[PDB]
Amino acid sequence: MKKIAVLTSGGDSPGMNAAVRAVVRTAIYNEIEVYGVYHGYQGLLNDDIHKLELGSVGDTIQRGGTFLYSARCPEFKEQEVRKVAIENLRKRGIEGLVVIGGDGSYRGAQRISEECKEIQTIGIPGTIDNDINGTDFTIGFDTALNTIIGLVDKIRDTASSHARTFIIEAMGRDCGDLALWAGLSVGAETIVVPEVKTDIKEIADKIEQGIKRGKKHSIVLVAEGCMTAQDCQKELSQYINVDNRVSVLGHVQRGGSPTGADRVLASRLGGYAVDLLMQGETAKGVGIKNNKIVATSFDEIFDGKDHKFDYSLYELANKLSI
Amino acid sequence: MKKIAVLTSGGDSPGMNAAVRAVVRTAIYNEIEVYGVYHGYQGLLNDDIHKLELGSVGDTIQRGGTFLYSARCPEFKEQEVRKVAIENLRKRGIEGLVVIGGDGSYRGAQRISEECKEIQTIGIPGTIDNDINGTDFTIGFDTALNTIIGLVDKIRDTASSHARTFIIEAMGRDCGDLALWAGLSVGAETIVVPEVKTDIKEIADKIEQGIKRGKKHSIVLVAEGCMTAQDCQKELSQYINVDNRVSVLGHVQRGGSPTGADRVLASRLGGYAVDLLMQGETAKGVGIKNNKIVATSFDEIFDGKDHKFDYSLYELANKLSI
Numbered sequence: 001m002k003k004i005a006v007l008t009s010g011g012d013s014p015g016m017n018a019a020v021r022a023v024v025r026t027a028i029y030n031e032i033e034v035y036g037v038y039h040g041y042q043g044l045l046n047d048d049i050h051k052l053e054l055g056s057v058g059d060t061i062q063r064g065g066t067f068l069y070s071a072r073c074p075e076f077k078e079q080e081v082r083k084v085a086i087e088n089l090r091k092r093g094i095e096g097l098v099v100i101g102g103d104g105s106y107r108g109a110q111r112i113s114e115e116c117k118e119i120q121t122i123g124i125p126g127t128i129d130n131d132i133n134g135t136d137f138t139i140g141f142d143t144a145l146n147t148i149i150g151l152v153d154k155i156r157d158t159a160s161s162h163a164r165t166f167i168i169e170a171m172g173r174d175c176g177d178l179a180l181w182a183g184l185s186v187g188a189e190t191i192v193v194p195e196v197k198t199d200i201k202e203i204a205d206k207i208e209q210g211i212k213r214g215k216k217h218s219i220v221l222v223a224e225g226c227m228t229a230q231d232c233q234k235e236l237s238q239y240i241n242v243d244n245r246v247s248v249l250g251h252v253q254r255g256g257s258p259t260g261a262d263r264v265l266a267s268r269l270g271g272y273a274v275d276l277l278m279q280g281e282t283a284k285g286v287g288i289k290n291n292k293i294v295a296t297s298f299d300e301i302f303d304g305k306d307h308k309f310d311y312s313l314y315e316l317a318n319k320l321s322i
Numbered sequence: 323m324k325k326i327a328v329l330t331s332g333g334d335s336p337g338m339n340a341a342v343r344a345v346v347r348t349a350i351y352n353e354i355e356v357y358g359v360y361h362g363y364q365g366l367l368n369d370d371i372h373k374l375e376l377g378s379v380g381d382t383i384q385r386g387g388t389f390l391y392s393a394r395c396p397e398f399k400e401q402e403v404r405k406v407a408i409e410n411l412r413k414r415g416i417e418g419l420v421v422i423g424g425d426g427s428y429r430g431a432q433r434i435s436e437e438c439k440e441i442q443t444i445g446i447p448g449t450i451d452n453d454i455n456g457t458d459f460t461i462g463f464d465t466a467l468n469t470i471i472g473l474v475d476k477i478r479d480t481a482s483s484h485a486r487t488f489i490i491e492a493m494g495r496d497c498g499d500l501a502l503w504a505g506l507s508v509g510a511e512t513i514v515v516p517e518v519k520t521d522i523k524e525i526a527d528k529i530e531q532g533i534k535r536g537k538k539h540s541i542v543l544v545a546e547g548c549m550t551a552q553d554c555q556k557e558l559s560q561y562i563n564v565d566n567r568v569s570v571l572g573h574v575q576r577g578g579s580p581t582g583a584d585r586v587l588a589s590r591l592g593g594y595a596v597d598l599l600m601q602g603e604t605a606k607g608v609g610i611k612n613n614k615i616v617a618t619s620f621d622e623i624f625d626g627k628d629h630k631f632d633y634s635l636y637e638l639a640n641k642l643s644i
């Protein structure tokens with residue numbers, strides 16, 4: 001394991017920079033040369049590959065986004081195209097590739113490893129969504145959670161004293177975790193997520209009761225994976241009079257400096273990735289499961305869903321809002 | 323389990339309010355009457371005990387500190403004095419007591435349960451220190467971590483461009499966790515903690531080398547449990563010329579709104595406390611261990627130290643700083 005490359009792929013997630021830093025510094029500590037691939041898999045195809053030194057990652061742990069950049073590279077689904085990426089790595093003597101991103105990014109990594117036995121690949125779970133098999137938390141989830149709290153606070157702090165209902169749309173893709181943790185965190189009356197069947201009539205009856213008791217500044221928090229905040233508002237207005245602030249929090253949830261949870265998680269997983277490469281491992285995603293740092297094969301990562309939405313935490317939220 | 327009391331004891335920790343809220347709302351959901359004890363165990367002795375309603379805990383999840391208040395009540399170490407506290411609860415028909423605080427607070431709770439079979443007691447681990455057996459994280463640790471990051475950022479953002487070394491004193495009592503996570507989080511050159519033997523000469527040789535390479539704004543982060551920032555500075559100056567900003571972060575580390583990690587942890591553990599009371603349990607502290615919500619007997623909590631300082635995370639920090 002003499003040369004490693006590292007790349008960031010998919011949407012930004014706070015802590016990507018910290019993960020790159022840990023890969024680069026850990027590599028060099030172990031006398032491994034490390035190359036940064038810029039613009040995700042696009043850079044891999046364009047040969048936008050450059051040697052990194054200790055100082056290339058200075059002043060990065062606190063930075064949001066990714067100093068390598070990212071792209072969407074849909075042509076990487078094609079085998080012929082991946083051949084060029086594999087040649088750009090191999091001509092450089094690269095023996096290991098670390099990919100930081102979500103589930104889609106991992107698929108690129110699996111293909112590489114299948115199509116070139118000479119390159120070991122390791123995935124690091126850089127996404128806000130919390131939706132990667134075999135890690136309990138992804139790098140960025142904790143940051144995104146606090147970002148949502150802060151955004152909610154500003155919406156309410158800047159609103160009319162008389163606004164009764166804030167319908168706020170959270171990210172998460174197909175996973176309701178962000179909406180659930182954020183909802184509980186801000187004291188939401190209602191949480192709308194793809195894992196629970198949404199009962200509009202119940203939700204509006206709750207709004208209306210509280211509006212009847214003079215309750216102001218109530219919040220419905222909505223995972224984008226279930227519906228948009230505007231559709232929620234439109235659907236509620238089929239029972240009750242309501243539209244008081246539809247808010248789409250949007251891509252800012254991906255921005256901003258990672259929290260300490262994310263910095264530390266990123267750091268542990270970036271170093272572990274390099275350890276695994278040195279140990280001969282391949283085709284695994286790294287994570288934290290039951291408070292242990294672990295590696296799971298991409299096959300198992302993609303074989304199912306690998307554990308439930310926490311319905312009991314959903315229930316606790318609803319109990320606390322009563 | 324018809325009546326519960328709840329109190330906060332020891333230093334403030336972000337998320338105490340969220341824990342009280344979860345106890346109160348969960349109790350009432352289950353048709354249990356819940357009484358707030360004000361000023362910790364002092365209120366217990368003064369009979370500063372009042373019925374809470376659903377609304378008594380409104381607008382509290384985001385609030386730092388504790389709306390019940392806290393005290394230090396050293397006389398509670400005396401059995402005769404505890405008799406008065408027990409009588410104030412029993413005369414009210416209180417059947418369960420939830421104590422939120424650190425290890426010292428738990429001791430009060432154990433005694434109560436030993437001295438009055440009619441009151442069940444449950445501890446909730448409200449402290450920044452991270453130093454309670456059988457939970458991996460205490461309520462406030464995550465908040466304190468981010469508070470430290472923010473404080474470090476402001477020290478550096480407001481300093482002379484030419485300051486070379488910031489010696490910053492972190493809380494933690496006898497546990498180095500806060501200093502370790504914060505250190506890694508801010509990219510500290512050095513981390514001084516009670517679990518690792520401090521090598522001053524090594525530390526100064528590292529400062530001096532980097533100062534020689536033109537490195538500015540370096541940080542030594544110091545757990546109060548190992549030494550003060552000023553003693554560290556004095557000890558370093560026995561090898562090298564240095565004193566560039568001694569900073570004692572101080573009690574503010576206990577203040578401020580809990581992070582989402584803390585709000586959610588607090589909430590889960592407050593509800594669990596009430597569940598346990600309803601189930602007949604007593605003399606247990608609740609926690610999160612290996613990502614599972616668990617209850618551990620006070621005897622086991624006080625029997626040892628129950629798991630290591632993470633030397634491997636300490637090592638990773640040092641590797642990343644090189």
Ligand SMILES: Nc1ncnc2c1ncn2[C@@H]1O[C@H](COP(=O)(O)OP(=O)(O)O)[C@@H](O)[C@H]1O
Nearest residue numbers: 010072073074076077101102103104105107108
């Ligand atoms: N099935 C796949 N096979 C190969 N490459 C893929 C696959 N899915 C995604 N990728 C690569 O990963 C990039 C990012 O994936 P995407 O699904 O947008 O993000 P995420 O990593 O967050 O799931 C895509 O643009 C593409 O280059």
Ligand SMILES: Nc1ncnc2c1ncn2[C@@H]1O[C@H](COP(=O)(O)OP(=O)(O)O)[C@@H](O)[C@H]1O
Nearest residue numbers: 332394395396398399423424425426427429430
């Ligand atoms: N051994 C003990 N027996 C009975 N009460 C105790 C004991 N230790 C502490 N307490 C009670 O808990 C209060 C807070 O404890 P302290 O040690 O200050 O905080 P923490 O709960 O953070 O450890 C003390 O003022 C006292 O009332």
